[PDB]
Design an enzyme around this catalytic site. Structure first.
Site: not given
Lengths: 268, 267, 267, 268
Positions: D46, D120, D162, D164
């Site tokens: 990623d 993102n 991620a 977050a």
């Protein structure tokens, strides 16, 4: 009868320091071993209290705080009583009590590479502003979790309100003896804080295939942690002395500072 | 010499037989069964709890052996039967008192009821609808007032129970503290507090409201009249625990939740 | 022209009088009251909800005015009665459809029951004891299985309700998504998920267990037979909302929780 | 028919790039405007996908990911299908779809001092390893909270998994269009994440009486934020193109990567 006054930057200082002289009580002032003294009066904030305590610890003598600006969980009384406290300062009728203080140890290659302590908390944080710190938490020889994170907090009950709290930790009353461990922004399903015994032994192992990390004790003292070493914290045998007195119980300080709706209470 | 064996409802007939050879009186259950010296039990934490109830009554140690699933209450698994049976007959196991709670219900200043919990005092709302208005109080001073599905009040040992589902913090079995956990509170500040053992948690229930339920250890129920205040403290009479070389709590936790521990060194 | 006024059980006689002068048929409630064009209401979110029920039935807009406490559902306070009454008579207020949920109970593959929620579909455990075993599923694929007090399934608007007490995330009223929130789950991963409106939340209840309760918007109850699966989706028939220049959600939130905003600049 | 291959460090690359030639399909390789191409195939993780996307955005062309090492929510398929995907790569029968991407703007003295974007997340973090970043969060012109913290996240649904997530945020399926705002280690009673509309306008105001702060977009791109300025984020009108195909739905990717007990499920 030497006292070591300490003020933040703070004008009611000379007052106290004069009233102290009137009782033939020596006095030194500060903002660095200030030994020989008897007590360590400090006027200011919690970040101030911490500094002052960093002095008292060394000298092995009581600490006493008087809030100035905002509110502080570490303060014994407000400025609207500078005399009352003062009165007790001279009368020496305040009760002194030891407070659970931590002992931090970095250990690499099985050898103690560094040493520190914390009356409030021990914050281990990643170095690079980017990426995540790979780590392993272990309580009493056995390891609980293996996760990446921003760090991990290890604090006394008294420091649960500070960064621990912000980090996600629960509140713990000051008179309780235990140890709070709060993962800091972990990337794991399980990342809840943990509370242990005052004798438990908390150790955190910094990944070896990664950058370095730092450790901050009470926000002041620092110390780089070399990749692949291990931060072991335990209850220091040498505690910080605290001057106590009829003060607002921790329960009220918490309601004040956070503004908690206490309406509807009846009482017993 | 008598031993009360308590089970849910197989390795048992092995505990009962081996025990007999050493000529030991064995009774079986699933009620104050006095006389005995120890109270062995084969089951889960649920089962364990009932047992501990009886042990509490008799004033004698408890000891368990997880049969089915994992439990933070058992001292040994099912493949260490003899091993334990051996300590059972030998009576060389440690007996350390465990902190227990004293739940008191007071209305108009009069102890309307009484109780005790070893794992948790879960105060709940009665109707399947609405919210319970409550005022939490630590040692004579209040810290919050809010509506919620209730308020847990557990022990370091109960922290892995409902308190943990309520989103509380993992406490450690040997630790001596009280964990208060707001149950689905509608407030900003509804996070768990932890106090000293001498601490006195009191929970005032809204007068202008319905009646509540208090569940001790998940079995012993009781009714709380609106406007009455629940008082919880350290019960002076603790439940005796049979201690023997077993997986330390840290392992149970990891084994139980499947916590990853890959990469750990050792020192 | 008829307007159904709904109240809890004073500024009302003012809405009813002023409304009359403009010769408008006014009925009062506290039941399909058809015919009318709008459904004004004076009360709290609770009150608002019942009203919305009726409005839902009739196929006509709702509109409210908080009387007592603050509510994220009302459009205006009690000091803007005429102001609103003026828009009520003038019929210049906006009418925007609001996302509503379609709760379906299926057993053996047969729609055993049916429902709809505007705020939340709170699935709960029946007995005051034990735990409800459940399997959450998003669009034909499962994401968890655990025991818990239940599973909320709200709307961006319901997010400030029970879902929020369950410790969910503040959603925004205009947002079009579904918020799933595990209620006191005993798992590691029990945090809220949020999905698209076309998403299909399904909740399979443990066969080898008791029966559950589903509460829509906190009023409409129904019984869930063990082993039956609850299906929640976007109801094609939305509840009409009367929109008029009012405090935006952000303000209601701050006003409601007393969120500090000191030091804000502006741009 | 020019494609811009991108691999992490990664040996099945030459394979693909050869099979691509066999269909007279041009090919460039990377690890910087690589324009003219048609698609942007990437093999890796990623953190790799993000890099590759940073290229595609610019060129205004589709992205497609193939996982190598660990698992990634951003990957469309595994390495056990390099041919299948490849097959679609040439057949050009994969569906392309725009994905909600953010647009970050720093603005001081009412003037745009900087500009960025994020497919993102947008992470605002304090500068000094010590202290807390005083801040003010405001949604659509109105301000919600005023607190000190380690920062504040603003991410797409796709970035909820991620940092977050680590920060405390809830999971949000990829196909949903909204905006996640997650306070980062706030020291306030209210600090829960917030989800808004794709049109809402999120702005965060950095205290003026304090140090500077940084902003990281997708972990890569950075940009210092001068005290007392204000970070405003909104839905960029220019979205990142994504190549789609019969792949494992987000629901499974989540169970895999986190190992979630899905046992007992019956189905419909």
């Amino acid at each position: 009868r030497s006292v070591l006054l300490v003020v933040h930057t703070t004008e009611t200082a000379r007052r106290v320091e004069k009233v102290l002289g009137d009782n033939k009580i020596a006095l030194r002032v500060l903002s660095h071993a200030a030994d020989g003294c008897e007590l360590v009066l400090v006027l200011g904030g919690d970040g101030t209290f911490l500094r002052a305590a960093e002095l008292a610890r060394n000298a092995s003598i009581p600490v006493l705080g008087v809030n100035l600006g905002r509110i502080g969980f570490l303060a014994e009384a407000e400025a609207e009583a500078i005399d009352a406290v003062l009165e007790h300062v001279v009368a020496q009728d305040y009760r002194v009590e030891d407070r659970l203080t931590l002992d931090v140890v970095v250990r690499q290659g099985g050898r103690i590479v560094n040493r520190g302590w914390a009356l409030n908390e021990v914050s281990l944080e990643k170095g690079p502003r980017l990426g995540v710190l790979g780590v392993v938490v272990e309580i009493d020889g056995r390891p609980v979790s293996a996760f990446g994170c921003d760090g991990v907090l290890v604090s006394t009950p008294t420091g649960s309100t500070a960064y621990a709290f912000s980090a996600g930790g629960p509140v713990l009353w000051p008179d309780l003896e235990a140890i709070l461990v709060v993962p800091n922004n972990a990337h794991a399903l399980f990342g809840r804080p943990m509370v242990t015994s005052p004798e438990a032994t908390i150790a955190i192992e910094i990944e070896a295939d990664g950058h370095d990390a730092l450790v901050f004790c009470d926000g002041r003292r620092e110390m780089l942690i070399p990749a692949g070493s291990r931060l072991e914290v335990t209850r220091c045998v040498t505690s910080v002395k605290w001057a106590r007195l009829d003060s607002a119980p921790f329960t009220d300080r918490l309601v004040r500072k956070f503004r908690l709706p206490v309406i509807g209470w009846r009482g017993k």
